[PDB]
C-alpha cells in the first residue's frame, strides 16, 4: 500500500502539489496510522537511502516533504493514541523483531530510525540521502517532540548530533534532547 | 602582441623563485606591487588594440588556472578584481572568459571555491538584461555533477548554491527574476527534476 | 634471416591455437623430458579483502609522520574526511612564542594545489598588530614559494615566518 | 551414419556391422574383401585430421603401450581391453580412415616419425588380441613380446577426458562461497585458453564458436547436455 503510494508520489515535480499530496497522504493513513507509519518507515527509509535507484528517486525537491510526513506521523505514533479501528482490529496481528525507552515496537522502530539517520550521515559518500537527512533535521523544529528523544536508557543519537555540525540556532534546538548533564555537555560542544 | 603581452605579464607575475631555499638568513608587497603590476598591465593593454582585448581577456584565463598555488590564485583573483574596479576590464567579459574552458568539475575543487568566491564578489557586474545568460553556464556546471561526489566537498562545492541563492534573492534589487526564469527554462522543460 | 617464422606467426590469425601443439610438443617432450618443470602447488587467492576503511589517505599520514615533534596536529570539525583529506589544525608547541593555529586546507592527494586557505584569519590577524605583521610576512613568503606542498613546505614556511618576524 | 552410399543390395550399417567377421590381419586385404568404392562423401573431408584422427590414433596407441603395463598400481591397471566389440568399432574406424587416406591424402600420420602405412602392424596386433578378445576367450604371450618393444612413432600425453572429483561425503572439502583456487575432445586444449572455451560437465570446456566450417555435426550434437556433461559451466577465461 504505502510502497505503491510513495512510488506514484515521486513524480510531482511541483512543490505546491507535493505538499498537497503529502498532507493528503498523512490524512489517509488514519485509522491505521501507527502500524502503517511504522512499516512505511522501517521498510522504505532503509532502502530509500541505501540503493542508487532510491537515491536518484529521493533526489527530487518533492522529497523534502517526505521527512515532514515522517516526523508528523512519528509523534502521533509516540503519543498515547490507541486508534483502535474495529475495521482494522482483526487485521492488526503480526510478529517481528524489527532487527533491533523499553522493548516496545514503536520504541525500537524509532531507534532503528535513529540508527539509519546516523548511518546516512556517514562520511566518505555524500549522496542525496545526506540532503535528505539534512531536510529531516531542518523539519525537526517542533514542540513537545520525540525526534531523537535522547532518553537516559541507551539513546546514542545525541553523539551523531555532533556530525550534524558538519552541515546555528537549529543546532542549539536539536541538541536540546533532554537537558541532561551529558546533554548539556554535547550542547556546549556543538556551541563551539 | 597578445603572446608577447602574456609573456611579459607572466615574467612580471611569476616573482616566486626558490633560490637557495635552505633555512638561511638570506634577506607587505602583496598590495603595493599588486597595484603596480595592475597599472603596468592597464598601461600596456590600453594601447594594444583593445577591440580584441576581450580575446586577450580569455587569454588571461590561460594563466589563471596554470599554477596551483592557492594563495597565489586568491591574490591574482583579488588584484584582477581591483583592476576591474578601476573602470577598465569590463566585468561581463572577464567573468564569461573565466567561467568556461577551465571549469574542471571536482578536478580543482580549491580553484573552484576561489573562482566562485571571486564571481560572488564581482557578482555586481552591472549590465543590460543580457547578464542572466552567464547564469545558464553556471547551471551547466551544476548539471555535470551527480550528487554522490564526496562527503568532504559538500560545503566547499556549496559555493555554487550560495552564489545562485544570493543572485536570485537579491534579484529584488539585482536583476529581473522573470528573465531568470526564462533562462533556467534551458534546464527544465516544465518539469525535469 | 629467418623471417619465414615471422610471416607464419603473422599468418596465425585463426582462433585454433592448438595445431601448433600437435606440431611442436611431440618432439619437444621427446628430446626434452621435464614433464613437471614446476611441480610446486600454486593456488593463492588474489583479492580477498584489503582496504584501510578506517582513516584518511595514508599519503598525508606518511608525510606528517616525518615532521618535527614541535608541530602538534589535531582534528577539526569533520569536513576534510576523504576528498579534501586535510584539516591542518596545528599548534607550534615548542620553546618559541606561541601563536594562532593555522588552517592550511589542502586538496586531494593529486596535489593540483596547496594547503593555505586562511578562513578563520579575518579576525585572528587584524586584531593584533604584531600578529598582523606575522601574517604579512607569512603571505609574502608563501607567495614566493613556487608550488608549495601539503604539510612540510607550508608548516615550515609558517614557522620560519612566525619566528623571523619577531623583530 | 556417414554412409551416403549409392543404392546397393543391403545397407551400409549392417554391412559395416558384419565387417567384424573378417580376415585375421592385413586390413589392406579386408578392405578389398568387403568394399572400397562406396565410402567417399565429400571433397572437403579435412575435418577429422586436426580433430579426430590424431585423437583416435593417440587412443589406440595408448591402448597398445598399455599391454606391457600389466603390473600397474591397480588390479585392472589403466584399462581392460577385454571387450573386443569396442575394438571392432575401432577396427571399422581405422579401415574407413584407411579408405579416406586412399581418397583424401589428409590421413592420420604416426605423429612422431618413420611411418614405414605404419598402422599395419598396429591393426595386426589389435586383431591378434582380438582373437583373444572376441567372445569366450582369454588373453594371450607372443602378443606381449610383439607389443613390448616400441618404434620411433610412439607419442604420449593423451587427454583422458574425465571430471574433477568431489569426494566430500564426510571427509574433506577445500572450498568457500567463491574464489575457486586453481591447481577437451576436438583438441583445442592449449596451455591457456584464448577463446570462449565454453566450460562443460566433465572435460569438454570446448570453445563456443569452434571456428568451424563443416564440422557442425559435433557442435549441433553437443548443444544439449553431454555424457557426464550436463554440468555446462561458465568458468571464466582467467588464463594464467
Swiss-Prot record, chain A:
Q: In which compartments does the protein localize? A: Nucleus
Q: What range of the parent protein does this fragment cover?
A: 742 to 985 of 987
The UniProt entry annotates the motif LXXLL motif 5 at 45-49
Query: What is annotated about its quaternary structure and interactions?
Result: Component of the Mediator complex, which is composed of MED1, MED4, MED6, MED7, MED8, MED9, MED10, MED11, MED12, MED13, MED13L, MED14, MED15, MED16, MED17, MED18, MED19, MED20, MED21, MED22, MED23, MED24, MED25, MED26, MED27, MED29, MED30, MED31, CCNC, CDK8 and CDC2L6/CDK11. The MED12, MED13, CCNC and CDK8 subunits form a distinct module termed the CDK8 module. Mediator containing the CDK8 module is less active than Mediator lacking this module in supporting transcriptional activation.
**Family (UniProt):** Belongs to the Mediator complex subunit 24 family.
Which organism was this protein described from?
Mus musculus (Mouse)
Any coiled-coil ranges, and where? none
Please describe what this protein does.
Component of the Mediator complex, a coactivator involved in the regulated transcription of nearly all RNA polymerase II-dependent genes. Mediator functions as a bridge to convey information from gene-specific regulatory proteins to the basal RNA polymerase II transcription machinery. Mediator is recruited to promoters by direct interactions with regulatory proteins and serves as a scaffold for the assembly of a functional preinitiation complex with RNA polymerase II and the general transcription factors. Required for basal and activator-dependent transcription.
Q: Which top-rank group of organisms is this from? A: Eukaryota
Which residues pair up as cystines? none
State what protein this is by name: Mediator of RNA polymerase II transcription subunit 24
Swiss-Prot record, chain B:
Domain of life, source organism:
Eukaryota
Subcellular location per UniProt equals:
Nucleus
Task: Give a short account of what the protein does.
Answer: Component of the Mediator complex, a coactivator involved in the regulated transcription of nearly all RNA polymerase II-dependent genes. Mediator functions as a bridge to convey information from gene-specific regulatory proteins to the basal RNA polymerase II transcription machinery. Mediator is recruited to promoters by direct interactions with regulatory proteins and serves as a scaffold for the assembly of a functional pre-initiation complex with RNA polymerase II and the general transcription factors.
**Which family does this protein fall into?**
Belongs to the Mediator complex subunit 23 family.
> Could you describe the subunit structure of this protein?
Component of the Mediator complex, which is composed of MED1, MED4, MED6, MED7, MED8, MED9, MED10, MED11, MED12, MED13, MED13L, MED14, MED15, MED16, MED17, MED18, MED19, MED20, MED21, MED22, MED23, MED24, MED25, MED26, MED27, MED29, MED30, MED31, CCNC, CDK8 and CDC2L6/CDK11. The MED12, MED13, CCNC and CDK8 subunits form a distinct module termed the CDK8 module. Mediator containing the CDK8 module is less active than Mediator lacking this module in supporting transcriptional activation.
| Protein name (record) | Mediator of RNA polymerase II transcription subunit 23
Q: Which gene encodes it?
A: Med23
UniProtKB/Swiss-Prot annotation, chain C:
Family note: Belongs to the Mediator complex subunit 15 family.
Principal location listed in the UniProt entry: cytoplasm
**GO BP terms, alphabetized:** positive regulation of transcription elongation by RNA polymerase II; positive regulation of transcription initiation by RNA polymerase II; RNA polymerase II preinitiation complex assembly; somatic stem cell population maintenance
The intrachain disulfides are none
Originating organism: Mus musculus (Mouse)
The entry lists its GO molecular-function terms as: transcription coregulator activity
Question: Where does this protein reside within or beyond the cell?
Answer: Cytoplasm; Nucleus
GO cellular component assignments: core mediator complex; cytoplasm; mediator complex; nucleoplasm; nucleus
Post-translation: what modifications?
Ubiquitinated by TRIM11, leading to proteasomal degradation.
Listed A to Z, the keywords are:
Activator, Cytoplasm, Methylation, Nucleus, Phosphoprotein, Transcription, Transcription regulation, Ubl conjugation
What does this gene product do? Component of the Mediator complex, a coactivator involved in the regulated transcription of nearly all RNA polymerase II-dependent genes. Mediator functions as a bridge to convey information from gene-specific regulatory proteins to the basal RNA polymerase II transcription machinery. Mediator is recruited to promoters by direct interactions with regulatory proteins and serves as a scaffold for the assembly of a functional preinitiation complex with RNA polymerase II and the general transcription factors. Required for cholesterol-dependent gene regulation.
Name-wise, this protein is Mediator of RNA polymerase II transcription subunit 15
UniProtKB/Swiss-Prot annotation, chain D:
- A single GO BP: positive regulation of transcription elongation by RNA polymerase II
Subcellular location(s): the record lists:
Nucleus
| KW Repeat (keyword) present | yes
Principal localization reads nucleus
Provide a Gene Ontology MF annotation, just one. transcription coactivator activity
Question: According to the UniProt entry, where is the signal peptide?
Answer: none
Keywords assigned by UniProt, alphabetized? Activator, Nucleus, Repeat, Transcription, Transcription regulation, WD repeat
WD repeat positions in this chain?
Answer: 69-110, 189-228
Task: Name one cellular component (GO) term.
Answer: core mediator complex
Which family does the UniProt entry place this protein in? Belongs to the Mediator complex subunit 16 family.
Query: Function, please?
Result: Component of the Mediator complex, a coactivator involved in the regulated transcription of nearly all RNA polymerase II-dependent genes. Mediator functions as a bridge to convey information from gene-specific regulatory proteins to the basal RNA polymerase II transcription machinery. Mediator is recruited to promoters by direct interactions with regulatory proteins and serves as a scaffold for the assembly of a functional preinitiation complex with RNA polymerase II and the general transcription factors.
- Which named protein is this? Mediator of RNA polymerase II transcription subunit 16
**Biological source species:** Mus musculus (Mouse)
Amino acid at each position: 500500500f504505502c510502497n505503491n503510494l510513495i512510488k506514484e508520489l515521486l513524480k510531482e515535480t511541483r512543490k505546491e502539489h507535493t505538499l498537497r499530496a503529502v498532507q493528503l497522504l498523512y490524512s489517509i493513513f488514519c485509522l491505521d496510522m501507527q502500524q502503517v507509519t511504522l512499516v512505511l518507515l522501517g521498510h522504505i527509509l532503509p532502502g530509500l537511502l541505501t540503493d542508487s535507484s532510491k537515491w536518484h528517486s529521493l533526489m527530487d525537491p518533492p522529497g523534502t516533504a517526505l521527512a515532514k510526513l515522517a516526523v508528523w506521523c512519528a509523534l502521533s505514533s509516540y503519543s498515547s493514541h490507541k486508534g483502535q479501528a474495529s475495521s482494522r482490529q482483526k487485521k492488526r496481528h503480526r510478529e517481528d523483531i524489527e532487527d533491533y525507552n523499553m522493548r516496545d515496537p514503536l520504541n525500537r522502530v524509532l531507534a532503528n530510525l535513529f540508527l539509519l539517520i546516523s548511518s546516512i550521515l556517514g562520511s566518505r559518500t555524500a549522496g542525496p540521502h545526506t540532503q535528505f537527512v539534512q531536510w529531516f533535521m531542518e523539519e525537526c523544529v517542533g514542540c513537545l517532540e520525540q525526534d531523537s528523544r535522547g532518553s537516559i536508557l541507551q539513546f546514542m543519537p545525541f553523539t551523531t548530533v555532533s556530525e550534524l555540525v558538519k552541515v546555528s540556532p537549529k543546532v542549539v534546538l536539536a541538541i536540546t534532547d533532554l537537558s541532561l548533564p551529558l546533554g548539556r555537555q554535547v550542547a556546549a560542544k556543538a556551541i563551539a | 602582441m597578445e603572446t608577447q603581452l602574456q609573456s611579459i605579464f607572466e615574467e612580471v607575475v611569476k616573482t616566486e623563485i626558490i633560490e637557495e631555499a635552505f633555512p638561511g638568513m638570506f634577506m607587505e608587497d602583496e598590495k603595493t606591487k599588486l597595484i603596480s603590476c595592475l597599472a603596468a598591465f592597464r598601461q600596456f593593454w590600453s594601447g594594444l588594440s583593445q577591440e580584441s582585448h576581450e580575446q586577450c581577456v580569455q587569454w588571461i584565463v590561460k594563466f589563471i588556472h596554470g599554477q596551483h598555488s592557492p594563495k597565489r590564485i586568491s591574490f591574482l583573483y583579488d588584484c584582477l578584481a581591483m583592476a576591474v574596479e578601476t573602470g577598465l576590464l569590463p566585468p561581463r567579459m572577464v567573468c564569461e572568459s573565466l567561467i568556461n574552458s577551465d571549469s574542471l568539475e571536482w578536478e580543482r575543487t580549491q580553484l573552484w571555491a576561489l573562482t566562485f568566491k571571486l564571481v560572488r564578489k564581482i557578482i555586481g557586474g552591472v549590465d543590460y538584461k543580457g547578464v542572466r545568460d552567464l547564469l545558464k553556464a553556471i547551471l551547466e556546471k551544476i548539471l555535470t555533477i551527480p550528487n554522490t561526489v564526496s562527503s568532504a566537498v559538500v560545503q566547499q562545492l556549496l559555493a555554487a548554491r550560495e552564489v545562485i541563492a544570493y543572485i536570485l534573492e537579491r534579484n529584488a534589487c539585482l536583476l529581473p527574476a522573470y528573465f531568470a526564469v526564462t533562462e533556467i527554462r534551458k534546464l527544465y522543460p516544465e518539469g525535469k527534476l | 634471416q629467418p623471417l619465414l617464422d615471422a610471416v607464419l606467426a603473422n599468418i596465425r590469425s585463426p582462433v585454433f591455437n592448438h595445431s601448433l601443439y600437435r606440431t611442436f610438443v611431440p618432439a619437444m617432450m621427446a628430446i626434452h623430458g621435464p614433464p613437471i618443470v614446476s611441480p610446486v602447488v600454486c593456488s593463492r587467492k588474489r583479492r580477498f579483502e584489503e582496504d584501510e576503511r578506517q582513516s584518511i589517505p595514508n599519503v598525508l599520514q606518511g608525510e606528517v609522520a616525518r615532521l618535527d615533534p614541535k608541530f602538534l596536529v589535531n582534528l577539526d570539525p569533520s569536513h576534510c574526511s576523504n576528498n579534501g583529506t586535510v584539516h591542518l589544525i596545528c599548534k607550534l608547541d615548542d620553546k618559541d612564542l606561541p601563536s594562532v593555529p593555522p588552517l592550511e586546507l589542502s586538496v586531494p592527494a593529486d596535489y593540483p594545489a596547496q594547503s593555505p586557505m586562511w578562513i578563520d584569519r579575518q579576525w585572528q590577524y587584524d586584531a593584533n598588530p604584531f600578529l598582523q605583521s606575522v601574517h604579512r610576512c607569512m603571505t609574502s613568503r608563501l607567495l614566493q614559494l613556487p608550488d608549495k606542498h601539503s604539510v612540510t613546505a607550508l608548516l615550515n614556511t609558517w614557522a620560519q615566518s612566525i619566528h623571523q618576524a619577531c623583530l | 551414419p556417414h554412409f551416403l552410399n549409392t543404392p546397393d543390395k543391403s545397407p551400409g550399417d549392417r554391412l559395416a556391422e558384419i565387417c567384424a567377421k573378417i580376415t585375421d590381419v592385413d586390413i589392406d586385404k579386408v578392405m578389398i574383401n568387403l568394399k572400397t568404392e562406396e565410402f567417399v562423401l565429400d571433397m572437403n573431408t579435412l575435418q577429422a585430421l586436426q580433430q579426430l584422427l590424431q585423437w583416435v590414433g593417440d587412443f589406440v596407441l595408448y591402448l597398445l603401450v598399455s599391454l606391457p603395463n600389466q603390473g600397474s598400481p591397480l588390479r585392472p591397471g589403466h584399462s581392460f581391453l577385454r571387450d573386443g566389440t569396442s575394438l571392432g568399432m575401432l577396427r571399422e574406424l581405422m579401415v574407413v580412415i584407411r579408405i579416406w587416406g586412399l581418397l583424401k591424402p589428409s590421413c592420420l600420420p604416426v605423429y612422431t616419425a618413420t611411418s614405414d602405412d605404419s598402422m599395419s602392424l598396429l591393426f595386426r596386433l589389435l586383431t591378434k588380441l582380438w582373437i583373444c578378445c572376441r567372445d569366450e576367450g582369454a588373453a594371450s604371450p607372443a602378443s606381449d613380446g610383439l607389443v613390448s618393444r616400441l618404434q620411433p612413432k610412439q607419442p604420449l600425453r593423451l587427454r583422458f577426458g574425465r571430471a574433477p572429483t568431489l569426494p566430500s561425503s564426510t571427509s574433506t572439502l577445500q572450498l568457500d562461497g567463491l574464489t575457486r583456487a586453481p591447481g577437451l575432445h576436438l583438441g583445442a586444449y592449449p596451455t591457456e585458453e584464448c577463446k570462449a572455451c565454453t566450460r562443460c560437465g566433465c572435460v569438454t570446456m570446448l570453445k563456443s564458436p569452434n571456428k568451424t566450417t563443416a564440422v557442425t555435426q559435433w557442435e549441433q550434437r553437443w548443444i544439449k547436455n553431454c555424457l557426464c556433461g550436463g554440468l555446462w559451466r561458465r568458468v571464466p577465461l582467467s588464463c594464467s
